[PDB]
Amino acid sequence: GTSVKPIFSRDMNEAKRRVRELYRAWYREVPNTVHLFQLDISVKQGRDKVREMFMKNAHVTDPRVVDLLVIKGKMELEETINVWKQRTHIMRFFHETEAPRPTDFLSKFYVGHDP
């Protein structure tokens, strides 16, 4: 029924807690990768990208779900500070080559039959 087995967190609050030290670690992590990975973006240009994912992932309310991606974020952070990823992998977050996609209905109508 409603009773489900929680992963680590026991309600929203410490689920809200775990997203913090992920942000705590990510924020401390940005400037050294920009140096180590020889990135083209600025130190400022990394914090927003770290930031914008977080409230992009904001409609989520289930405590089990919240703890599930905080592990994925931790793993992504894990596979970043050992330079396991590469310049291309990190840059894939910046949708650079992909041209901007329209948003208004009229532009959708002009390009092709798609919602």
Partner 1 sequence: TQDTQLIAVDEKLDITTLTGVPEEHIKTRKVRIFVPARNNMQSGVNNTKKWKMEFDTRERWENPLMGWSSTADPLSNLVLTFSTKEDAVAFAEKNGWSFDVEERKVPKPKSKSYGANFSWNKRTRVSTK
Partner 2 sequence: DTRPTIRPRNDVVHKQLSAFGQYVAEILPKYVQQVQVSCFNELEIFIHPDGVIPVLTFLRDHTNAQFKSLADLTAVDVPTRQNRFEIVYNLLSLRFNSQIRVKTYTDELTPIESSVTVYKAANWYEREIWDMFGVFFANHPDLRRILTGYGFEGHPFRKDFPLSGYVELRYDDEVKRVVAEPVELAQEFRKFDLNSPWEAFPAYRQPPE
Ligand X SMILES: CCCCCCCCCCC[C@H](O)CC(=O)SCCNC(=O)CCNC(=O)[C@H](O)C(C)(C)COP(=O)(O)O
Binding site for ligand X (CB under 6 A): 16, 19, 22, 26, 46, 49-50, 53-55, 57-58, 60, 66, 69-70, 73, 76, 90, 93
Binding residues vs partner 2 (CB under 8 A): 4-5, 7, 62, 64-65, 68, 71, 75-76, 78-79, 84-92, 96-98
CB atoms inside a 10 Å sphere around CB 30: 21
- Tell the residue number behind the tokens 């904001």, with chain if given: 58
Q: Is 4 in the site for partner 1 (CB under 8 A)?
A: yes
Look at phi and psi of residue 83 and say left if phi exceeds 0, alpha if psi is from -120 to 50, else beta: left
- Tell the residue number behind the tokens 């992009």, with chain if given: 56
The binder of 100, among partner 1, partner 2, ligand X, none, by C-beta within 5 to 8 A per type, is: none
CB of residue 36 to partner 1, shortest distance in Å: 27
State how far the Cα of 63 lies from the Cα of 9, in Å rounded to an integer: 7
